[PDB]
Amino acid sequence: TKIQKYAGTAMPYPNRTMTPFYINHLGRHGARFPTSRKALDKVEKVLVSAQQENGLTSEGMALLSMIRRLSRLFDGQWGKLSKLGETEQEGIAGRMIRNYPQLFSNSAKIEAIATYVPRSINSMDAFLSCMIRHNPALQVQRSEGKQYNHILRFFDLNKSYVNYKEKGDWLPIYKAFVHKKISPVPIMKKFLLNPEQYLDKEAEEFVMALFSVAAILPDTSIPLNLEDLFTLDEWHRYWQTQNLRQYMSKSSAPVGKMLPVAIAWPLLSEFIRSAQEVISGKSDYQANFRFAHANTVIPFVSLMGIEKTDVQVCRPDSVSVYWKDYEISPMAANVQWLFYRDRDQRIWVKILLNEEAAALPISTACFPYYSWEKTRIFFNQRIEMAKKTLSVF
Amino acid sequence: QTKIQKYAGTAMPYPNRTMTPFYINHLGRHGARFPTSRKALDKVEKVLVSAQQENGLTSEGMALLSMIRRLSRLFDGQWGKLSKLGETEQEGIAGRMIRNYPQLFSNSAKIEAIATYVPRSINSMDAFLSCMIRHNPALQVQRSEGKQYNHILRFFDLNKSYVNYKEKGDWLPIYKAFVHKKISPVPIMKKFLLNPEQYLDKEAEEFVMALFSVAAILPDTSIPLNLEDLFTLDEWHRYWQTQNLRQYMSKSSAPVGKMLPVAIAWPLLSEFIRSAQEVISGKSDYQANFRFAHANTVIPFVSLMGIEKTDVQVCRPDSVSVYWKDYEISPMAANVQWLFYRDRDQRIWVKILLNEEAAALPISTACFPYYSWEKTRIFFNQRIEMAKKTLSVF
Numbered sequence: 001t002k003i004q005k006y007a008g009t010a011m012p013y014p015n016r017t018m019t020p021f022y023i024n025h026l027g028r029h030g031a032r033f034p035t036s037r038k039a040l041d042k043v044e045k046v047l048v049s050a051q052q053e054n055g056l057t058s059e060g061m062a063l064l065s066m067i068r069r070l071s072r073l074f075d076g077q078w079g080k081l082s083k084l085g086e087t088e089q090e091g092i093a094g095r096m097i098r099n100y101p102q103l104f105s106n107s108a109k110i111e112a113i114a115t116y117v118p119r120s121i122n123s124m125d126a127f128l129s130c131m132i133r134h135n136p137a138l139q140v141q142r143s144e145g146k147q148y149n150h151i152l153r154f155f156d157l158n159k160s161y162v163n164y165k166e167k168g169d170w171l172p173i174y175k176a177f178v179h180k181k182i183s184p185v186p187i188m189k190k191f192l193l194n195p196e197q198y199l200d201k202e203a204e205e206f207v208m209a210l211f212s213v214a215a216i217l218p219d220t221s222i223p224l225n226l227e228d229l230f231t232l233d234e235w236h237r238y239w240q241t242q243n244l245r246q247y248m249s250k251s252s253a254p255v256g257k258m259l260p261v262a263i264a265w266p267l268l269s270e271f272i273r274s275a276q277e278v279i280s281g282k283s284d285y286q287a288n289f290r291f292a293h294a295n296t297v298i299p300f301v302s303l304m305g306i307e308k309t310d311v312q313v314c315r316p317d318s319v320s321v322y323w324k325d326y327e328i329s330p331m332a333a334n335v336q337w338l339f340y341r342d343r344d345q346r347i348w349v350k351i352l353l354n355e356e357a358a359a360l361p362i363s364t365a366c367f368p369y370y371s372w373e374k375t376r377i378f379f380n381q382r383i384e385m386a387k388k389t390l391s392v393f
Numbered sequence: 394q395t396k397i398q399k400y401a402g403t404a405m406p407y408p409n410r411t412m413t414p415f416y417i418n419h420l421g422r423h424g425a426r427f428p429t430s431r432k433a434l435d436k437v438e439k440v441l442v443s444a445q446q447e448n449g450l451t452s453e454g455m456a457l458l459s460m461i462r463r464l465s466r467l468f469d470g471q472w473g474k475l476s477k478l479g480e481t482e483q484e485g486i487a488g489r490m491i492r493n494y495p496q497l498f499s500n501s502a503k504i505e506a507i508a509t510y511v512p513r514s515i516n517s518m519d520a521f522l523s524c525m526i527r528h529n530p531a532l533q534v535q536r537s538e539g540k541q542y543n544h545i546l547r548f549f550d551l552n553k554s555y556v557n558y559k560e561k562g563d564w565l566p567i568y569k570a571f572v573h574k575k576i577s578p579v580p581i582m583k584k585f586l587l588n589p590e591q592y593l594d595k596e597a598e599e600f601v602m603a604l605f606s607v608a609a610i611l612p613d614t615s616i617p618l619n620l621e622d623l624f625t626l627d628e629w630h631r632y633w634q635t636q637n638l639r640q641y642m643s644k645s646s647a648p649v650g651k652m653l654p655v656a657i658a659w660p661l662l663s664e665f666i667r668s669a670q671e672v673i674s675g676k677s678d679y680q681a682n683f684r685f686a687h688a689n690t691v692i693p694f695v696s697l698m699g700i701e702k703t704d705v706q707v708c709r710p711d712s713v714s715v716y717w718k719d720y721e722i723s724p725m726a727a728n729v730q731w732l733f734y735r736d737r738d739q740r741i742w743v744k745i746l747l748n749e750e751a752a753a754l755p756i757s758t759a760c761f762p763y764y765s766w767e768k769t770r771i772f773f774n775q776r777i778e779m780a781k782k783t784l785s786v787f
């Protein structure tokens with residue numbers, strides 16, 4: 001549904017209901033609780049002040065009661081993987097096993113890594129537990145922690161990127177876009193008597209915080225829904241603003257000068273190396289799994305050059321036409337490279353983005369399968385471009 | 394567009410389409426048209442008339458025959474013609490062009506249009522040019538058409554190797570088996586005939602495929618009649634898949650065609666580059682070149698440009714509909730526009746529009762949807778050299 005897409009990177013993993021010799025994987029953690037109480041506290045603070053001064057409507061009184069309930073239910077759960085998130089990983093693992101049982105048979109060896117963040121470790125474990133229940137004779141190497149920061153949390157390690165993310169030139173563009181797209185008064189009219197008395201700044205922060213609470217609720221497995229606080233057109237506009245925020249701060253927006261994308265090259269390098277070692281026999285893993293974050297997936301996909309995902313759109317109002325974050329990095333977003341060897345020992349690779357075949361701007365006579373030689377050369381050119389970009393910052 | 398509209402494939406009507414360039418380079422298919430051939434209508438009519446003569450029609454069959462007889466009257470004399478809708482489609486494309494780029498077509502701007510010899514393409518050109526001239530009568534206009542342009546607009550009739558492939562190439566066994574798998578005629582015939590069993594599978598499938606064809610073209614004719622509800626949405630979906638596959642295999646980048654259907658379009662791509670180079674160099678003073686032709690012109694031209702999606706090579710026939718959609722490439726009035734811009738540094742940019750939406754090429758640009766013309770030209774020249782190499786094998 002359009003409403004689910006307008007949750008953007010908070011969208012739940014979508015519904016997804018001859019044999020490769022290797023699978024190379026990167027997956028975001030599954031659906032999670034909100035990481036921060038900031039938006040909830042802001043909504044609550046506004047409605048409480050209104051209640052003190054007799055300023056709430058009937059529905060604002062009901063919203064306040066509901067916000068108070070969510071505050072209690074979110075307490076001690078911030079950033080945790082939800083039941084839905086566990087179920088999402090079990091589905092991804094389960095389909096992979098169902099689709100390629102030969103690959104995971106007969107004491108096959110798999111390795112999984114995760115970041116130090118608990119929701120990513122727990123996503124790894126839900127995935128691996130499914131793997132093991134299906135074939136307990138798998139050999140399994142499991143590790144996680146800050147030792148993987150350079151390939152899984154590179155967005156925390158590059159000084160120029162951190163500065164850009166915190167105070168770079170994309171910020172004024174985003175804020176002007178929000179002011180253009182989001183009209184706070186009609187939304188607040190639903191909840192507050194005399195909403196025109198609120199300054200535009202506080203009105204905007206209230207509404208954006210409320211959208212944030214509503215957008216994450218379907219990821220929590222809590223049986224409550226707030227999608228009807230906003231019309232479909234209001235969700236559409238909210239999504240356009242958050243989509244633009246993700247694009248400019250994490251992807252290939254001209255304002256970022258490809259800095260957000262270039263920082264991902266160590267992960268693309270490690271992907272190529274693990275595949276080359278398996279192909280050569282230096283490694284005999286049947287799969288490498290990696291569990292991380294939207295901030296890992298988004299630039300990695302752009303650096304691979306998956307078609308659409310690395311477009312450089314110069315007009316901010318055109319971004320949503322050409323680049324759609326809910327297609328790139330929903331909850332549990334994942335990239336899988338599937339390697340095949342044909343009868344003449346040639347190596348083919350299929351790229352799956354959220355379990356659907358993805359296109360690269362190189363030729364192939366057998367789409368969705370690409371020549372690995374051609375693909376690796378292409379990816380190496382992308383890494384070299386990334387290194388050149390970083391040499392200027 | 395609704396699903397039922399998309400399932401009309403290349404018979405889908407042009408979709409709804411409700412800083413200054415110095416040149417526009419255009420190719421357009423004719424607008425919505427009448428059926429070119431009475432074969433399908435006659436096959437449907439002869440089966441229904443013959444069953445009626447032996448009292449073999451259901452009530453729904455009788456209603457369908459009454460409708461088929463009206464269509465035969467209304468199609469009479471009109472075969473192949475541009476319809477009123479086809480005219481309004483061209484007026485909309487020209488009108489939106491004029492509104493989007495008014496400075497290009499102001500004062501005494503010079504434009505040239507060509508068309509094939511086929512009347513619906515000539516009439517589409519004239520619908521388009523009348524809009525131009527009515528908006529600005531001070532335009533200078535050069536108008537021409539005919540078989541003299543077959544080499545760039547109907548190259549699909551001129552290449553012996555391609556004509557042989559189109560008529561008796563290796564794609565036909567694939568297409569016929571795909572139709573047999575996808576189309577079950579018996580449920581449809583039970584709707585209209587008492588005892589569909591007395592028909593062989595061969596004639597039953599011919600009847601159903603003809604009825605689909607009659608129903609698919611009707612929205613293009615401006616006749617206030619409609620036959621979509623003769624079929625379920627799933628039946629339309631399967632019919633569209635078979636016709637999409639036929640277009641892909643006989644006209645585009647299917648592996649079974651070995652790029653022969655696409656390579657034949659290189660004279661038209663070369664002529665696009667020539668007319669823009671002559672304007673950039675000053676040899677030519679035109680502000681636009683317009684060209685009116687056919688789906689068989691547009692489909693391989695788009696694939697030879699390498700517009701993303703449109704040149705995919707899919708070996709599994711069942712996967713084609715997932716990755717290649719003929720209603721997105723060549724609906725009625727399908728058109729390609731190249732818009733050329735000169736920035737403050739005298740650099741040439743080009744924007745490629747497919748059916749008035751920005752198209753992507755597999756080359757990089759820091760200002761999508763605008764590409765460097767130098768980079769684009771070099772890429773297009775590489776596409777032409779590939780095409781010539783493909784043709785030397787045939």
Ligand SMILES: O=P(O)(O)O[C@H]1[C@H](OP(=O)(O)O)[C@@H](OP(=O)(O)O)[C@H](OP(=O)(O)O)[C@@H](OP(=O)(O)O)[C@H]1OP(=O)(O)O
Pocket residue numbers: 009010028029034035036117292293294295
């Ligand atoms: O720890 P935080 O400072 O709160 O950062 C989180 C987190 O970023 P990191 O995990 O990389 O540190 C989320 O990324 P995920 O782990 O969920 O993949 C991101 O989620 P989105 O990518 O969907 O934006 C979220 O944003 P939000 O709080 O709006 O949900 C963002 O929090 P901040 O927006 O405050 O940076």
Ligand SMILES: O=P(O)(O)O[C@H]1[C@H](OP(=O)(O)O)[C@@H](OP(=O)(O)O)[C@H](OP(=O)(O)O)[C@@H](OP(=O)(O)O)[C@H]1OP(=O)(O)O
Pocket residue numbers: 005324327394399718721
């Ligand atoms: O069914 P298709 O003819 O293949 O078109 C689909 C359809 O777009 P429209 O129905 O509006 O024409 C999708 O809508 P959904 O069914 O997924 O809801 C849309 O997805 P978005 O609206 O999210 O853009 C998607 O576009 P996309 O390329 O982003 O997948 C696009 O597919 P294509 O245009 O690529 O064929």
Ligand SMILES: O=P(O)(O)O[C@H]1[C@H](OP(=O)(O)O)[C@@H](OP(=O)(O)O)[C@H](OP(=O)(O)O)[C@@H](OP(=O)(O)O)[C@H]1OP(=O)(O)O
Pocket residue numbers: 403404422423426429430511686687688689
């Ligand atoms: O007149 P025909 O020799 O029978 O060919 C026509 C015609 O092809 P050409 O005009 O290029 O020769 C149509 O193309 P358009 O002029 O309409 O653009 C095409 O239409 P489609 O591309 O939509 O298939 C049509 O097919 P149909 O009769 O099923 O509508 C096709 O007839 P053929 O089946 O003989 O190719």
